[PDB]
Every structure is written in structure tokens, then in C-alpha cells.
């Protein structure tokens, strides 16, 4: 008989009841097959007893002994079936035979709920052509089980992965004001697909999916946590459904001032705190995750944590130096572009928006003594250009009550000292014969004194409102969360758990479908958190669809992105093949190090399973996986010529490298600085509510006499500020059970020592890189861009981190 050990976690975690005839397992042979070519299956074997021997276990886990009637004639077991006869589900961790290891990490529901018996494979890795013959059909049948048939309402215990469009955000049955365009499946609104839920149509609209208390994700995608405080993804739901209403009542009852009246009222939030009604505090204080967001006296006070950006200087955010520095080392460091001609041009139709010629004059700019031609030629001119991106939406946004924006463009000059300085801001508005508004476009230049300094500060706020919107919806939501989901779905639908590429990529998908489903429900839904806290309101998500029209997979590679944006040039004589035009560009310089480490890892892994390009072309699973990811997952862009073909080792490496980059380092860089930089609403306003005032009006006089109030009346109001600070605080927090780049949730994910050795080298390289990044932050010559006047060391690309709001650490995946 074969001695075995089963490790599982009872539901209450995320014992004698498991004995008796509660759980049975059946070994399956990988070498001996029946008359049909399928591995022979053993007898039902039940758990015999609780093993309390090994000191190693922890995590609310329990081990059970079991002995299998299996002689050499049945061959070597390569898989097993398991049936749970208990009413309640349990989390199966692993099976070990004494060595043959099985890494399961899967919920096993009552046997009657399953159409086919749950099957698990040993930790060996096989491309299809290498699958032991007795396991071939089992392998394909499990993939067919995972794909489902594209119909039906998905249930909690289902493990069916499929695609659908974003037609579940509107709530037309509640109000036609909550109706939203379907995103995806049309040329008007192209969009990445998301996980199919199948709840069916709304009563009023056959094209929109009805509401649901729970937005399904394949069962094992819904991460349980040993500590409730680690279930960060449930925070947005509680925030939108419970906390927001409580905050709103405090305002409706006039228990707290409706608006901030000075910058100190904002600073007060993380100092003495804000006093709220007792019942409001009582509503918030007992909630999991939410209670970790604020310190309280348990009675009337809520205190937010001090954001990193003000920890050394609370006023530094208002410096021109910090405004420009955050474009290369801030929460959204990947939009700035080189400017090689002047004035900047627009590709928008003047027949629609009016003359689009820039009004910025070269002679008005202070380029530290450089002429415009000199600045252009020396590659010292850059820009943060939101003119063409926002112009198409300015009219409709400005028609909203309490929303007014400009399509902005900021010109930056790279000083000889290596820091960026802002030299002009153009605030553009569309013009069309017949416009009722008399407001016009204008250029604002830097100023430190007088009303001119206030107008320049407001111009920076309009720019950052554009940036915050683009950051949240595009850099963050579209480019990481939404763009990655199709790849997660395709991977489970077409790459067997035995597949080397499945093993290479899946750690980088942890919690992504889960947070996305929770986002469709409470973050990007009609009247959800984003719509109620950011400038575009009901136009927010569709704006991301317009941007997706220009999304290019291969341009997500870091070198390609830097080159496309004109912030680096190709240069083979450099370590990374590219020369940065802003040498001390923190995000890019640190990013290239991480990018290189991932590349080395993928390049070492792939060859272990694919010897030649032909081996990649002939992998049926791999080919079906890619064809589906492109043609269905990102199907609205299937007509684009830039998609890799995946017929060579090079292409496979490229595709995997880009996927891992987006899921780990790119997402970390644009996510974990959310509260550290945006926790002070003045530094990262999410909305603007009025345009610049006309001379001779009280609003203009206010800019002169009360600049802080002029600023506060312009940016996000206090109520939505409380809600948005809470959400970005959640998003910037690392759960204590996070799995970071260079780590895996199990040391036995594969039995291949070669793959394991390569992974160990990858982790060692990341530790090596962290020491280098530490040296960069400690280098006094780099203080200007790596720390700035806010004296905040750029640690967002440090690979490792402890739990919490740390401003560092690269998780493997888009996990929050
Ligand atoms: Fe995120």
C-alpha cells in the first residue's frame, strides 16, 4: 500500500468529521492504461486519521493519513480523483505519496454539485506532446470542463472560464439615468473582454446584464484569507454600499461643514482627524478592512494616515519642482513624452473643435537661457499632453453640474541639473459656432507672486485632474486590470495545469479576476465609486474604451514604451538596449532593471520546454491559447497587424515577458503610490468643478484674497474626497498574504529541478536589484528626481515589502 498525506483547510479557516466515509480519493495511473488508453483508476480510499506529526504546516491547515491499495502493476500514479461527501466544502491544499507531490490549492464542494469528479495532477510539467499517454484524454477533458459551453448562470462552485463584454455596469432597470453603453463588441466602443457571469438580461434592456448580489468568478479565483484584514478586495463594496451612505448622511444633516475652507481643513484629516456623528462612526468602525483605514476614538473621530508625500514637508507638493518630478517618479510616471517640434500640434478636427493651433509662444518660455531650437535639438523639451485625449470629451463633461475641465498640455524643460521644470500650461476648450459659453482657452505661465501665482497653481490643478483621470482609468484600470483579464481567461481555458507556460504565467494572475469582478460591481459601475468621485462622472468608463482604440500590446513592453514616448532612444551599446533622454527618470531606470530580470527568467525557462521554434508552433494548447486570447479576449483589436504570431521561441518569450511585466512591475508602479501621493487631495485632485474666473467677478477677487479657498472650490469637494481617499488607501495596501515577484505560493509547483533552479536565480537577481535601487536612493546626486522637495525616496519598484501601506514591493499580479 502507498502511504499518503492529505493537507486541507476546513472552510471556517478562510476534524474527525473528515474521517469515516466523508472524503474519498482514487489514484490514477500515468503509466498503466485501460482498454481505451486512459490511466487505470484505483479504489475509493477514505481518510484514515489525523496526522499530527510534522511541525511544518501552519496556516490553519490539517494533515490526514491515508493508504492506497496500489501495487507496481498499476504503474506510477500521476493524478487522482477526489469526492467530498460532506455537506460543506473544504480547501484542498495537497496530496503527498511516499516522493510524488500534488499541489492542489482548490476548493472541493459536495460531490453532488459537480457534473464530473474533481481531478488533480502530480506536479510534473508537460507540453502536450510530452503528456504521458494514459493522461492525455484526462488532460483534454479537464480543459473542456474548464471552458464550459458558453451558456448558463454561473454558480459559486463553478470553475468555468469564458468571456463576455462589459454590459453589466449600467443599472437601467433601476433608472434610465443609470443606463450605460456596452463596452466591447462594437467599433464605437472596443474593449477587452471580462469573465462571463451569465446572470441574464435586465427587464428593460436585452443587451445589459441584470444586477447580482455576487458577481461570479471561477471558484478558485476567489481568494480566501486567513486574516479578514487581508480581504482588501471586499473594501470597495463595503465602501460604496455602507460607508458612503453613512458619510452622505453626515453631510445631509449638516453635522460637518460641506466644503473645506482652508488647506489646514484638509491636513486636519490625518492630524486631529474629522469629527463625525456617533452613528456614522459606529457604522464604519466594526467593518473588516474598512476599520483598518482610520484611527478612531470609537466615538466621533476618524483619522486618516499621514500620506508619504507630506511626511517631511507638507507644502512641497505645491512646488513646480515636485509637480514636474511626479511625472517621472509619481503615481503616473508613464505619460510624459519628448517634444521634438514647436509649437505642439494636434490631430483633432478644427471643423469640430475650432482652430487647434497652440497659443503657447516660444519667446515667452524660460528655458534657462536655451533658445527653443537649442532645447529641441538637445532633446531637453518634453510635454504631458492631454489635449487630444481630453478635447473630445470636454463639452459633454462641462455640461455636467459641478464638473468643468480643460484639455491640458504642460511643457517641461529638462534643466542642465537633470531635473524637469514646468514652463507653460495650455488650458484648452473646444469652440463651435453657437456655443453658449463665453469661456476661452488660455495659456498660463509660472508665477510665484500675486494673483498670477494663484492662476498658475489652479492651472497645475487642471493638469493634475486630467492626469488623475487618465491615471486611474487608463494607466491603472485599462492597462493593467482590464487588459490582463483576457489572458487569465485564455490561460485557464487552453493551457492545462500541467503546461509549462501555465505554470510560468498563472502566479501573475492571482486575485485579478476577483478584484475585477468586485470592480465591475462597485468601482466602475453606474453611480459607483469612480463615477461619483472623478471628473468624467458617467463618461468615465467609456473614455477608457476610446483610449483602448489605441492600445498596442507590444507597446506595453517597457523599452518599446520609452521609445514610443520619445523619452529614450534605441542604443545597442547600452545594457538595456535603450538610452534614456532623462537620465535620472526613476520609474524608467528602475523599471529597466526589473524588466531585464524578468526577461532573463523567461529566456531561461522557455528553453527548458521548447528546443526550437518548431516546438512552439506545434504546441496545440499554446496555439489555441494565443489564438483565443487575441481573437476573443482582445477580439475588438484582432484586426491589428502588431500582434505577435507565436511561431518562434522569440515570440513566446516576448509575449510571456510582456504579460508578466504588466501584471507585476507596471501595475505596482502605477498602483502603490496611490495614497502615498494622492492622500493629500490638493496634490492629486480627482475632479475640477469650475473654469478659471473672469476678471471683475467675485470669483476672481477670491483668487486674490483667499487663494486656498479658490483652490478648494475648484477641486474635488470634501464628501467625494473622503470617499476617494478611503478607496486609494485600500488600493495602496499590501495584504500580509501577498506573493511577490520572485516568490511562489508553493516550493513544489513543478518537479523539474532545472525550472526550480532558474526560479531561484531570478529571486536572487531581484534581491541584487533591490540593493542597487537602495544605492540609487542614497546617491546625493540623484536626490532631485528620486526624492524631490517632498524628500520621498522612490521605492515603488523595490521588489520586496512587508504588509501595509509601504510605497514599495512588486506583487506577482494585479491583486488589488
Ligand atoms: Fe490595481
Swiss-Prot record:
Compartments, record wording: Cytoplasm
Effect of residue 471 to Q: 37% of wild-type activity
Effect recorded for residue 731 to A: Reduces catalytic efficiency more than 14000-fold
Record flagged with keyword Transport: no
High-level lineage: Eukaryota, Viridiplantae, Streptophyta, Embryophyta, Tracheophyta
Any one of the GO CC terms: cytoplasm
Job description of the protein: Plant lipoxygenase may be involved in a number of diverse aspects of plant physiology including growth and development, pest resistance, and senescence or responses to wounding. At pH above 8.5, only (9Z,11E,13S)-13-hydroperoxyoctadeca-9,11-dienoate is produced, but as the pH decreases, the proportion of (9S)-hydroperoxide increases linearly until at pH 6.0 it represents about 25 % of the products.
Subunit-structure text: Monomer.
Activity-pH behavior: Inactive below pH 6.0.
Gene3D superfamilies found in the cross-reference section: 3.10.450.60, Lipoxygenase-1, Domain 2 (4.10.375.10), Lipoxygenase-1, Domain 3 (4.10.372.10), Lipoxygenase-1, Domain 5 (1.20.245.10), PLAT/LH2 domain (2.60.60.20)
Result, substituting residue 472 to E: No effect on catalytic activity
This protein's encoding gene: LOX1.1
Cofactors that this protein relies on: Fe cation
Tree of life domain: Eukaryota
Family: Belongs to the lipoxygenase family.
Domain spans labelled Lipoxygenase: 125-816
Effect of residue 671 to G: Reduces catalytic efficiency 5-fold
EC id: 1.13.11.12
Pathway assigned in UniProt: Lipid metabolism; oxylipin biosynthesis
GO molecular function, one term: oxidoreductase activity, acting on single donors with incorporation of molecular oxygen, incorporation of two atoms of oxygen
Ranges where the PLAT domain occurs: 10-122
Consequence of changing residue 508 to Q: 20% of wild-type activity
InterPro entries: LipOase, LipOase_C, LipOase_C_sf, LipOase_CS, LipOase_Fe_BS, LipOase_plant, Lipoxy_PLAT/LH2, Lipoxygenase_dom_3
Residue positions binding Fe cation: 476, 481, 667, 671, 816
Protein name (database record): Seed linoleate 13S-lipoxygenase-1
Catalytic EC class: oxidoreductase
Phenotype when changing residue 494 to Q: 33% of wild-type activity
Induction description: The hydroperoxide product serves to activate the resting enzyme. The activation is accompanied by the oxidation of Fe(2+)entadiene structure.
Amino acid at each position: 500500500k502507498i502511504k499518503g498525506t492529505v493537507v486541507l483547510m476546513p472552510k471556517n479557516e478562510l476534524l474527525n468529521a473528515f474521517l469515516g466515509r466523508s472524503v474519498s480519493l482514487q489514484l490514477i495511473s500515468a503509466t498503466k492504461a485501460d482498454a481505451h488508453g486512459k490511466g487505470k483508476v484505483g479504489k475509493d480510499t477514505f481518510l484514515e486519521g489525523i496526522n499530527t506529526s510534522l511541525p511544518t504546516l501552519g496556516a490553519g491547515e490539517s494533515a490526514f493519513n491515508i493508504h492506497f491499495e496500489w501495487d507496481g502493476s498499476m504503474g506510477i500514479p500521476g493524478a487522482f480523483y477526489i469526492k467530498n461527501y460532506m455537506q460543506v466544502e473544504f480547501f484542498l491544499k495537497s496530496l503527498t505519496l511516499e516522493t510524488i507531490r500534488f499541489v492542489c490549492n482548490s476548493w472541493v464542494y459536495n460531490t453532488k454539485l459537480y457534473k464530473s469528479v474533481r481531478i488533480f495532477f502530480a506536479n510534473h510539467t508537460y507540453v502536450p506532446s510530452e503528456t504521458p499517454a494514459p493522461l492525455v484524454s484526462y488532460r483534454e477533458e479537464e480543459l473542456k470542463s474548464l471552458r464550459g459551453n458558453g451558456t448558463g448562470e454561473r454558480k459559486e462552485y463553478d470553475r468555468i472560464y469564458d468571456y463576455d463584454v462589459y454590459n453589466d455596469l449600467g443599472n437601467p432597470d433601476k433608472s434610465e439615468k443609470l443606463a450605460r453603453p456596452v463596452l466591447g463588441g462594437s467599433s464605437t466602443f472596443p474593449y477587452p473582454r471580462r469573465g462571463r457571469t451569465g446572470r441574464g438580461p435586465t427587464v428593460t434592456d436585452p443587451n445589459t446584464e441584470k444586477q447580482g448580489e455576487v458577481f461570479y468568478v471561477p471558484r478558485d479565483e476567489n481568494l480566501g484569507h486567513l486574516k479578514s484584514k487581508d480581504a482588501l478586495e471586499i473594501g470597495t463594496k463595503s465602501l460604496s454600499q455602507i460607508v458612503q451612505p453613512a458619510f452622505e448622511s453626515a453631510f445631509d444633516l449638516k453635522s460637518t461643514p460641506i466644503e473645506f475652507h482652508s488647506f489646514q481643513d484638509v491636513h486636519d484629516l490625518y492630524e486631529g482627524g474629522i469629527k463625525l456623528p456617533r452613528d456614522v462612526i459606529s457604522t464604519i468602525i466594526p467593518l473588516p478592512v474598512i476599520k483598518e483605514l482610520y484611527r478612531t476614538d470609537g466615538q466621533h473621530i476618524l483619522k486618516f494616515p499621514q500620506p508619504h508625500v507630506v511626511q517631511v514637508s507638507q507644502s512641497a507638493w505645491m512646488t513646480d519642482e515636485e509637480f514636474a518630478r511626479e511625472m517621472i517618479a509619481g503615481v503616473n510616471p508613464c505619460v510624459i513624452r519628448g517634444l521634438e517640434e514647436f509649437p505642439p500640434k494636434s490631430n483633432l478636427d478644427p471643423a469640430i473643435y475650432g482652430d487647434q493651433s497652440s497659443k503657447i509662444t516660444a519667446d515667452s518660455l524660460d528655458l534657462d537661457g536655451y533658445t527653443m531650437d537649442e532645447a529641441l535639438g538637445s532633446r531637453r523639451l518634453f510635454m504631458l499632453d492631454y489635449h487630444d485625449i481630453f478635447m473630445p470629451y470636454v463639452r459633454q463633461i462641462n455640461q455636467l453640474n459641478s464638473a468643468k475641465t480643460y484639455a491640458t498640455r504642460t511643457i517641461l524643460f529638462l534643466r542642465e541639473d537633470g531635473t524637469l521644470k514646468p514652463v507653460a500650461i495650455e488650458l484648452s476648450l473646444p469652440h463651435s459656432a453657437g456655443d453658449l459659453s463665453a469661456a476661452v482657452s488660455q495659456v498660463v505661465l509660472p508665477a510665484k507672486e500675486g494673483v498670477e501665482s494663484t492662476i498658475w497653481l489652479l492651472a497645475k490643478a487642471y493638469v493634475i485632474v486630467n492626469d488623475s483621470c487618465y491615471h486611474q482609468l487608463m494607466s491603472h484600470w485599462l492597462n493593467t486590470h482590464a487588459a490582463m483579464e483576457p489572458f487569465v481567461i485564455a490561460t485557464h481555458r487552453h493551457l492545462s495545469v500541467l503546461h509549462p507556460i501555465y505554470k510560468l504565467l498563472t502566479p501573475h494572475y492571482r486575485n485579478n479576476m476577483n478584484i475585477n469582478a468586485l470592480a465591475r460591481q462597485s468601482l466602475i459601475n453606474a453611480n459607483g465609486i469612480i463615477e461619483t468621485t472623478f471628473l468624467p462622472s458617467k463618461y468615465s468608463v467609456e473614455m477608457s474604451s476610446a483610449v483602448y482604440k489605441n492600445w498596442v500590446f507590444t507597446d506595453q513592453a517597457l523599452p518599446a514604451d520609452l521609445i514610443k514616448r520619445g523619452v529614450a532612444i534605441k542604443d545597442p551599446s547600452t545594457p538595456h538596449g535603450v538610452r534614456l533622454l532623462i537620465e535620472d527618470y526613476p520609474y524608467a531606470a528602475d523599471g529597466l532593471e526589473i524588466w531585464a530580470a524578468i526577461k532573463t527568467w523567461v529566456q531561461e525557462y522557455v528553453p527548458l520546454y521548447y528546443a526550437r521554434d518548431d516546438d512552439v508552433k506545434n504546441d496545440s494548447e499554446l496555439q489555441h491559447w494565443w489564438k483565443e486570447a487575441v481573437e476573443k479576449g482582445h477580439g475588438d483589436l484582432k484586426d491589428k497587424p502588431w500582434w505577435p504570431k507565436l511561431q518562434t521561441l522569440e515570440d513566446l518569450v516576448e509575449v510571456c515577458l510582456i504579460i508578466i511585466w504588466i501584471a507585476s512591475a507596471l501595475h505596482a508602479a502605477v498602483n502603490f503610490g496611490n495614497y502615498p501621493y494622492g492622500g493629500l487631495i490638493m496634490n492629486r485632485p480627482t475632479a475640477s468643478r469650475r473654469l478659471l474666473p473672469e476678471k471683475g467677478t467675485p470669483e476672481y477677487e477670491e483668487m486674490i484674497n483667499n487663494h486656498e479657498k479658490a483652490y478648494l472650490r475648484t477641486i474635488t469637494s470634501k464628501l467625494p474626497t473622503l470617499i476617494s481617499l478611503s478607496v486609494i488607501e485600500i488600493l495602496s495596501t499590501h495584504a500580509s498574504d501577498e506573493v511577490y515577484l520572485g516568490q511562489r505560493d508553493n516550493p513544489h509547483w513543478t518537479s523539474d529541478s532545472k525550472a526550480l533552479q532558474a526560479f531561484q536565480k531570478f529571486g536572487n537577481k531581484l534581491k541584487e536589484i533591490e540593493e542597487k535601487l537602495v544605492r540609487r536612493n542614497n546617491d546625493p546626486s540623484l536626490q532631485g528626481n528620486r526624492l524631490g522637495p517632498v524628500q520621498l525616496p522612490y521605492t515603488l519598484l523595490y521588489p520586496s515589502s512587508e504588509e501595509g501601506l509601504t510605497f514599495r514591493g512588486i506583487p506577482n499580479s494585479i491583486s488589488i
